[PDB]
């Protein structure tokens, strides 16, 4: 029953806030700086290292204020909360690509508005 296309999510998992690769990197780098200082702490996990280097290589824009800007501008337009982060991670270059990647947006908004949002996304790309 759990399908990303039809937007079924667990009730316990419904209210969670979804995240971007770049902001996940800034959080993980904050944790890394926290652990490297204040010694006599456990060594970070292989999972932590893999996620850190993954989101480093997959970081779209490094700027912190850009994260807040893109989040706010995209949420201002009425869209489902799960779609914000997946769209910003994938960064489609055409609205046809965006609808192919996420079928939910197909028919949700017109081609011109979808392409304008995508163009803003690439505009804030670093």
């Amino acid at each position: 029953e759990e399908d990303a296309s039809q937007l079924i999510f667990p009730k316990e998992f419904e209210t969670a806030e979804t995240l971007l690769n770049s902001e996940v990197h800034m959080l993980l780098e904050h944790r890394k700086q926290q652990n490297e200082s204040a010694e006599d702490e456990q060594e970070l996990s292989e999972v932590f290292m893999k996620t850190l280097n993954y989101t480093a290589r997959f970081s779209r824009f490094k700027n912190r204020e850009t994260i807040a800007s893109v989040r706010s501008l995209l949420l201002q337009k009425k869209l489902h909360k799960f779609e914000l982060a997946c769209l910003a991670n994938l960064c489609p270059e055409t609205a046809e690509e965006s609808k192919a990647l996420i079928p939910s947006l197909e028919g949700r908004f017109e081609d011109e508005e979808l392409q304008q949002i995508l163009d803003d996304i690439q505009t804030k790309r670093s």
Partner: protein
């Protein structure tokens, strides 16, 4: 997909950790227990950003241990049947291609691989390539992927992916 959720857990403390710093030891115990852990229901718990609340700890009757109900914000990774995320190749093999996603590792099978991606054993690095020789899928490449199915192994999540879908390939 990456998320920010609040979770509930209870940690037992041995009486020797009471000390003058009990809450710090509580924080350390929770970190060491739920850092890098995996649950089939909620997926990978990558890191704990903050601890929302640490409740009143109850002394177990007949046991010196004390359990604290703890509220904490953690970032989780649990993939979907139907989500699309970019992945990175780790190994080229004749059974299939090994690619790495975050903490989790998934493989694409040959029958799920489109028939255009022919095998190249004889290339010095084993490769997935077309007859037109345009698309070169090789070790350490970053690719699009469609994860269809997930499995839990020793409370750790592994998944499987599909690549038949359009536009889904090399970045």
């Amino acid at each position: 997909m990456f998320y920010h959720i609040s979770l509930e857990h209870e940690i037992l403390l041995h009486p020797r950790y009471f000390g003058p710093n009990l809450l710090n030891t509580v924080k350390q115990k929770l970190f060491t227990e739920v850092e890098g852990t995996c649950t089939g229901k909620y997926g990978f718990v990558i890191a704990v950003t903050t601890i929302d609340n640490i409740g009143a700890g109850v002394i177990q009757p007949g046991r010196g241990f004390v359990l604290y109900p703890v509220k904490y914000k953690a970032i989780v990774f649990r993939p979907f049947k139907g989500e699309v995320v970019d992945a990175v190749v780790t190994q080229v093999n004749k059974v299939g291609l090994f690619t790495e996603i975050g903490p989790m590792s998934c493989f694409i099978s040959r029958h799920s691989i489109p028939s255009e991606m022919e095998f190249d054993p004889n290339s010095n690095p084993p490769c997935y390539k077309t007859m037109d020789e345009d698309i070169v899928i090789q070790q350490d490449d970053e690719i699009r992927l469609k994860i269809v199915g997930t499995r839990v192994d020793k409370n750790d999540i592994f998944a499987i992916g599909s690549l038949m879908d359009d536009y889904l390939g090399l970045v």
